Amino acid sequence: GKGNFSACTHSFGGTRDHDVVEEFIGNIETYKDVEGISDENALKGISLLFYGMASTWWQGVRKEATTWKEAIALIREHFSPTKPAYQIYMEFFQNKQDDHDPIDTFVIQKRALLAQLPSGRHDEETELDLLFGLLNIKYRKHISRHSVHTFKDLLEQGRIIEHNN
């Protein structure tokens, strides 16, 4: 029911992205859940993980924290900004697919970029209608817009059109 973080292999040096902060916070959560450390006994030991710029940052803001929840909220708030609405739409229409790229990677990326909008703002139909207008000419000359509905079918038609070529 007690112990330090000194045994861990994870450390967060501070970089402004999403995947790194998410993976680090998840690993720290699994470690604290697995070794049984309690909530108020855990906050005192948190300093050992940071290094470089993160150590100076934690030395800065420290009296505003009081429990574990506030610490996670502060890290997430200062090291991964929430992008506003319009930048996502601007990023979405500035990158048409190239001749050398399978349908799967393109659809997966363009779908992963669309979930950051506030929930419930879009329907499957309107989103799929938005997705066209960027597919390269090799696929648009066969499948027609009024012969598809959900995302399960577009991948099917794309695979059959790919294997024939």
Q: List contacts with a copy of itself (CB under 8 A).
A: 1-2, 4-11, 16, 19-20, 22-23, 26-27, 30-31, 33-36, 41, 44-45, 47-48, 50-53, 55-57, 59-63, 77-79, 81, 87, 102, 104-105, 108-109, 111-112, 115, 152, 155-156, 159, 163
DSSP 8-state secondary structure symbol assigned to residue 96: P
Q: How far is the CB of 144 from a copy of itself (least distance, A)?
A: 22
In whole angstroms, the minimum distance from the beta carbon of 125 to a copy of itself comes to 16
Q: How far is the CB of 159 from a copy of itself (least distance, A)?
A: 7
Alpha carbons 90 and 95: distance in angstroms, whole number: 10
- Given the complex with a copy of itself, which of 129 and 155 has the nearer CB atom? 155
Which lies closer to a copy of itself via its Cβ, residue 146 or residue 150? 150
> To the nearest whole angstrom, how small is the minimum distance from the Cβ of residue 41 to a copy of itself?
7
CB of 63 to a copy of itself, least distance (A): 8
**C-alpha gyration radius of the chain:** 23
Query: For every residue of 52-94, which 3-state class applies, written as one string?
Result: CHHHHHHHHCCCCCCCHHHHHHHHHHHHCCCCCHHHHHHHHCC
Nearer to a copy of itself, 2 or 142 (CB): 2
Q: Which is nearer to a copy of itself, 33 or 146 (CB)?
A: 33
Say how far apart CA 25 and CA 68 lie, in whole Å: 12
CA distance linking residue 111 with residue 131, whole number of Å: 9
The residue with tokens 């794309």 is 158
CA distance 51 to 165: 53
